[PDB]
Amino acid sequence: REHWATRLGLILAMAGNAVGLGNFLRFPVQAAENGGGAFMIPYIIAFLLVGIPLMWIEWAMGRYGGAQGHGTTPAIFYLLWRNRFAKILGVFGLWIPLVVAIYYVYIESWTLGFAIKFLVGLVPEPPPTDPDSILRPFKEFLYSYIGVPKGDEPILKPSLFAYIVFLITMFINVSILIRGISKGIERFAKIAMPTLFILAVFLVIRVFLLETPNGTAADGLNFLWTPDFEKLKDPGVWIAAVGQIFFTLSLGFGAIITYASYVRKDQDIVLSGLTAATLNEAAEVILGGSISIPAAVAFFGVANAVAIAKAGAFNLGFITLPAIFSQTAGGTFLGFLWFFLLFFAGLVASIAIMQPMIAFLEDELKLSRKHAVLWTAAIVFFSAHLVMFLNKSLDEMDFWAGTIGVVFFGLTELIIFFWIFGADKAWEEINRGGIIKVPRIYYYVMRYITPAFLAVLLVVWAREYIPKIMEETHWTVWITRFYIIGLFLFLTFLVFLAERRRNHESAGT
């Protein structure tokens, strides 16, 4: 049973577990939509009150579980709280990261293919003042890549290039994963993370060199870090912030769990945990935030940039930014560094979220790692044809898995641990082996404040928001829902087969 070779590599694998497209694509959008410093106050408080305490919880659960030879939730949950219903609530730990992995690798597939075309100079050349005559070639460029419908039909038809780049991205994930935890993953994490922070810093610097009549890049800064204290009363903001906090730290993914289960029993989660997190927060609020937004706020001024991120998630990353760059000396290459940064950022993140499914096939169904990975790739590859060819199918999985399910699972796994399993046994399992220890106040966050946050939020969500989604939507949503439900069923059948194999051989041995 594998463990992390070196401590730094651990932290670097854990920081790359958190760090990814969320730092770069996602964060700028959620902050732009939610109005800068109006988003940050919630984001920070959520970080302390939710992200922080939740990460230690997931850490401990992973380590505690790995000690018993179990990396995933369906197993671990049985241990903390003994039930057939503990296993069932644990199937969300396989399900969330799987469904997320489905559309996530595909979006990272985009970054790779763009970086490729952007290097070789296959990008479009805009006409030598007007923003729309500028952004359009790139809008068309992305739309041509992912095959956005020209018709009414909710039907995507990606390019032969995008398709093959996905197969490649899939291969590259396999190649990292098939070498295991220390050899495959921990190596790459040591390479990638510095390789990442360097590319980011360079871009941050190079982006600060932008000025137009419309603004400096220091305009975007003071938009992001200067509060609106009135929006403190707006629930949608608080809902947006925690959605970022979860997604950013890979909370509720059953990710931190699986990785941490390869931590040796004695090893400190209480420092390495905090470190890899504070690394991500750097890659988010410091690096990630200081690139995409300030560039647009510089070119188009604030209000227009804010209007671009509302117009789509991929507007800023895949369209606006490379467009801005093309107005500068060697901007096509500076674009390649953008998408190259993204690929490497998503590659550390994607190998993390495909692991839980792999660790399961290993720890439970007793599959060779080679086999665990191939099938995990096969399932993800196949299932994603839905995301690729069906319009807005991507939106659906993001909502159920990486939006709702993550919060549902976070509160769930906090309850199972800090309540059912009991407070102090958990409080011990955390600080145990710790190089340093969790502040006494954080005991009382984990027990009360944290779940009080998630429960109340999950209310203000369900009551004041959700039904419109479940109602107003086009009927193609039921195709994704159908499938990803049959994924839960499929997974539950494996949890079933696992406990059956357990019952049979344990009676013979």
Residue ranges binding Na ion (CB under 5 A): 20, 22-23, 248
**Least separation in angstroms between CB 23 and Na ion:** 4
Q: Is 192 exposed, middle or buried (0-12, 13-18, 19+ CB in 10 A)?
A: buried
User: What letter represents residue 465's amino acid?
Assistant: Y
Whole-angstrom Cα Rg for the chain: 22
**Least separation in angstroms between CB 98 and Na ion:** 19
Nearer Cβ to Na ion (141/188): 188
Nearer Cβ to Na ion (22/90): 22
User: What letter represents residue 214's amino acid?
Assistant: N
**Least separation in angstroms between CB 233 and Na ion:** 27
Nearer Cβ to Na ion (20/184): 20
Instruction: Give 83's DSSP letter.
Output: S
Q: For 152-162, give one letter per residue: b (16+ CB within 10 A) or e.
A: eebebebeeeb
User: What letter represents residue 52's amino acid?
Assistant: I
DSSP code per residue over 107-160: HHHHHHHHHHHHHHT-S-------SHHHHHHHHHHHHHHTT--SSSSSB----H
Nearer Cβ to Na ion (23/258): 23
Nearer Cβ to Na ion (267/280): 280
Within 10 Å of residue 443's Cβ, how many Cβ atoms?
18
**Least separation in angstroms between CB 14 and Na ion:** 12
Nearer Cβ to Na ion (25/491): 25
Cβ contact 316:324 at 8 Å: no
**Least separation in angstroms between CB 276 and Na ion:** 12
State which residue has the least CB distance to Na ion.
Answer: 22
Q: How far apart are CA 49 and CA 246, in angstroms?
A: 12
Q: How far apart are CA 222 and CA 224, in angstroms?
A: 5
Q: How far apart are CA 100 and CA 305, in angstroms?
A: 28
Cβ contact 96:254 at 8 Å: yes
**Least separation in angstroms between CB 280 and Na ion:** 6
- The residue assigned the tokens 């969320």 is 22
**Least separation in angstroms between CB 367 and Na ion:** 29
User: How far from each other are the two terminal CA atoms of the chain, in whole angstroms?
Assistant: 20
Binding residues for phosphocholine: 84
Binding residues: 84
